[PDB]
């Protein structure tokens, strides 16, 4: 059958870019919204024949949304709080897809509202997405919701918050974070694995996935295990250190700081699960693991050890770091 056109919001982001590259390669035409045509990713995607970019802001720009969905049959939507009004943009996009009438399957990248499952605060950049999910669920078009695990490539030795693989004077690495050293966290190789997984959801179809929540995570590892993966990968001493507060070594926008403080409370103080929804956690009885559906969607997923050994050194050198010589 003719590969269907996919409308994408979040094209230059890790999830969108991953989907777009593989989707185009297998024949899908893509209509993607971007803030601006400039940028390494935007310029890269613009050069893919099957991809068409539409520049402009989404905030209060229903016309751009209508244009985006024109002639599209599939949609992958991942919004951001940066411009603010993420909830309004999410609803506007959903309504726009419905109005188009041609969208057969709408995939929205959602996150949990932790305040619904315990004496925990809602993580500011996550909870809003769940509100959009609830709204999307009530629209007449088939929809599926994917929950992204922590990006393997968040790790960097640059002084950025939460996921810094700090290079010490002796050449060893230390990762400091509020997470409990031994509680398994959900991870994800966004660049390589998000795209293939999303395409399989699209290939499976709306009858199989309408109304479903899928955890896009292929590997769970505690912080100590992540560091052990880097250690084996790099042949260097890498150790995890639990800290009460996130070490914020650089200036960050106010919204991110609030995101980090919520994280300190949720994972630091409370040790709550990353994915707190109940569905995410006798002879022959076998309970579903959080990584089961994702692995079934895409069997060629890559682990943390592969990232640390094969990609981390390149990304680091690309950022100007020198430890890899």
Q: Among residue numbers 22 through 51, which ones bind K ion (CB under 5 A)?
A: 51
The CB-of-90 to Cl ion minimum distance in angstroms stands at 21
What, of Cl ion, K ion, none, does residue 192 touch, CB below 5 to 8 Å by kind?
none
Tokens at residue 235, please? 């042949």
Residue 28, exposed/middle/buried by CB under 10 A (0-12, 13-18, 19+)?
buried
Bridge partners of residue 51, in order along the sequence: 30
Which residues, 14 to 43, sit near Cl ion by CB under 5 A?
A: 29, 31, 36-37
Q: Does 148 sit near K ion (CB under 5 A)?
A: yes
Q: Residue 176 interacts with Cl ion (CB under 5 A)?
A: no
Q: Least Å distance between CB 245 and K ion?
A: 25
Report the DSSP beta bridge partners of residue 319.
none
Residue linked to tokens 């106010």 = 254
Three-state secondary structure along 145-175?
A: EEEECEEHHHCECCCCCCCEEEECCCCCEEE
Residue 240 burial (10 A CB sphere; 0-12, 13-18, 19+) = buried
Which region among 103-111, 165-173, 217-225, 305-313 touches K ion (by CB under 5 A)? 103-111
Could you say whether residue 55 binds Cl ion (CB under 5 A)? yes
Specify the residue, 71 or 159, whose C-beta has the smaller distance to K ion: 71
Which secondary structure element, helix H or strand E, spans residue 21, and what is its range?
Answer: helix 14-25
b/e 167-179 (16+ beta carbons within 10 angstroms → b)? beeeeebebbbbb
299 scored as a contact of Cl ion (CB under 5 A): no
224 binds K ion (CB under 5 A): no
Between 99 and 289, CB nearer to Cl ion = 99
Q: Are 8 and 16 in contact (CB under 8 A)?
A: yes
State which of residues 81, 109, 164, 217 lies at the interface with K ion (CB under 5 A). Answer: 109
227 binds K ion (CB under 5 A): no
| Contact track, Cl ion, 135-164, x by CB under 5 A | ------------------------x-----
Residues forming contacts to K ion in the complex (CB under 5 A) are 51, 109, 147-148
Residues forming contacts to Cl ion in the complex (CB under 5 A) are 3-4, 29, 31, 36-37, 55, 104-105, 159
């Amino acid at each position: 059958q003719q590969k269907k056109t996919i409308a994408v919001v979040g094209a230059t982001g890790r999830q969108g870019a991953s989907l777009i590259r593989v989707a185009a390669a297998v024949g899908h035409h893509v209509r993607a919204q971007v803030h601006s045509l400039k940028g390494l990713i935007a310029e890269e995607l613009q050069a893919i024949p099957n991809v068409t970019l539409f520049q402009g802001p989404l905030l209060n720009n229903v016309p751009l949304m209508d244009t985006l969905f024109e002639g599209a049959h599939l949609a992958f939507i991942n919004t951001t709080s940066q411009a603010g009004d993420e909830i309004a943009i999410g609803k506007d996009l959903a309504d726009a897809a419905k109005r188009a009438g041609t969208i057969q399957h709408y995939i929205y990248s959602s996150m949990p509202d932790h305040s619904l499952y315990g004496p925990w605060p809602a993580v500011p950049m996550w909870a809003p997405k769940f509100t959009v999910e609830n709204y999307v669920r009530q629209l007449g078009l088939p929809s599926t919701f994917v929950y992204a695990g922590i990006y393997n490539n968040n790790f960097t030795s640059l002084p950025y918050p939460l996921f810094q693989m700090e290079l010490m004077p002796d050449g060893t690495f230390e990762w400091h974070a509020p997470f409990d050293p031994d509680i398994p966290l959900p991870w994800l190789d966004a660049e390589h694995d998000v795209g293939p997984a999303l395409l399989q959801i699209f290939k499976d179809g709306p009858q199989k996935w309408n109304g479903h929540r899928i955890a896009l995570t292929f590997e769970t590892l505690s912080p100590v295990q992540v560091c052990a993966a880097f250690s084996r990968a790099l042949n260097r001493r890498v150790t995890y250190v639990q800290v009460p507060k996130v070490e914020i070594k650089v200036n960050i926008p106010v919204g991110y700081r609030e995101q980090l403080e919520a994280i300190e409370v949720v994972f630091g103080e409370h040790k709550a699960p990353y994915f707190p929804l109940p569905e995410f956690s006798p002879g022959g009885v076998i309970s579903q693991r959080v990584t089961d559906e994702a692995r079934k969607l895409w069997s060629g997923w890559r682990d943390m050890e592969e990232y640390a050994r094969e990609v981390f050194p390149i990304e680091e050198e690309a950022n100007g770091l020198d430890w890899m010589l």
